Every structure is written in structure tokens, then in C-alpha cells.
Amino acid sequence: GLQQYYVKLKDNEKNRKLFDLLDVLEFNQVVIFVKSVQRCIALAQLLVEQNFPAIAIHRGMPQEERLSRYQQFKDFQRRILVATNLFGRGMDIERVNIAFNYDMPEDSDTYLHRVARAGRFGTKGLAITFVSDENDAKILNDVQDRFEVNISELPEQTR
């Protein structure tokens, strides 16, 4: 179903909110998107230290390396994937039950493509996006105005 929500907070509150949501929310596999390779690597490192089996897969990584790492995610050796973007298919993230946009996507098309992938084939799940500046808010409105998708503040048949 990929229920979509957003949280408006300062960027320096993101780790705090992220950590909070991960213990309170029920989840099997999760994917978290960040805007840069540096943030991708660091966030995964922070999570692992917090005893969260996370792994980073980012642009620049050789096709074979991405798959080896993603394979670990698929076999549940890692339950949290931190990525900079979606890659080809096979990178079937529709398996996740939660998708976080730690950093708001660059634009509304990217945002839709991500929820479409995390919810591919109409699979169920939750989508949570962090809004930290007026640019992020603008994009959020773009998604709602352009696609008429329902995104509210965080408080079989097609899903």
C-alpha cells in the first residue's frame, strides 16, 4: 500500500528521529535514501554502531559490488540498506516494509519513482520522508499537486 508520511524537523534532528522510528516501528527489511555518497557511508556506519544491521550501496560502486552487498540484504544478513539511489531491477527493494527518505529526493519525479519501486507491484509498506528546508517542502507539494498522492504528517487487492 505504501502509506506515505512526512516529518518536518531540522536536519540536525534527523538521526534522533531516525533512531526513534526504528525502535518503535515494526519492520523486516528497510531502505533509507540519502543525498550523497558521503552521507550514505556515514549513516550506515552510525547505524551499525547502534546495533542496526545496516549496509551502504551507493553510486560509483561496481555493478558486481552492488549485487554482492545487495545479496546480503536479500539473504537478511543485513536488514537495513542505505542507498543514494535505485539501480536496475533485481535491486528489488519492493521487499522492504519501510522506505525512508532521510534526505528529501532532488525532485518529485524521483520521489514518485522511489515509492513506486519500494511499493512495486502494489506491495505493502510505509514511506517516511524528512522535510528540513523550504526546498524539501516545495518538492513535497510538487508530488501532491502533480500526482494527487496522499502524504500526511507522521502522527489480494492492490496495495
UniProtKB/Swiss-Prot annotation:
- Where in the cell is the protein located? Nucleus; Nucleus speckle; Cytoplasm
Residue ranges annotated as transmembrane are: none
Which positions form S-S bridges?
none
Q: Where is the signal peptide?
A: none
Top-level lineage group: Eukaryota
Q: Which residues form the Helicase C-terminal domain?
A: 1-155
Subunit composition and interactions: Homodimer, and heterodimer with DDX39A. DDX39B interacts with the THO subcomplex to form the THO-DDX39B complex which multimerizes into a 28-subunit tetrameric assembly. Component of the transcription/export (TREX) complex at least composed of ALYREF/THOC4, DDX39B, SARNP/CIP29, CHTOP and the THO subcomplex; in the complex interacts with THOC2. THOC1-THOC2-THOC3-DDX39B subcomplex is sufficient for the interaction with export factor NXF1-NXT1. TREX seems to have a dynamic structure involving ATP-dependent remodeling.
What role does this protein play? Answer: Involved in nuclear export of spliced and unspliced mRNA. Component of the TREX complex which is thought to couple mRNA transcription, processing and nuclear export, and specifically associates with spliced mRNA and not with unspliced pre-mRNA. The TREX complex is recruited to spliced mRNAs by a transcription-independent mechanism, binds to mRNA upstream of the exon-junction complex (EJC) and is recruited in a splicing- and cap-dependent manner to a region near the 5' end of the mRNA where it functions in mRNA export to the cytoplasm via the TAP/NXF1 pathway. Splice factor that is required for the first ATP-dependent step in spliceosome assembly and for the interaction of U2 snRNP with the branchpoint. Has both RNA-stimulated ATP binding/hydrolysis activity and ATP-dependent RNA unwinding activity. Even with the stimulation of RNA, the ATPase activity is weak. Can only hydrolyze ATP but not other NTPs. The RNA stimulation of ATPase activity does not have a strong preference for the sequence and length of the RNA. However, ssRNA stimulates the ATPase activity much more strongly than dsRNA.
**Domain free text:** The helicase C-terminal domain mediates interaction with ALYREF/THOC4.
Family membership, please give it: Belongs to the DEAD box helicase family. DECD subfamily.
Q: What protein name is recorded for this chain?
A: Spliceosome RNA helicase DDX39B
Organism whose genome encodes this protein? Homo sapiens (Human)
Q: Which gene encodes it?
A: DDX39B
The residues of the intact protein that this chain contains are: 261 to 428 of 428
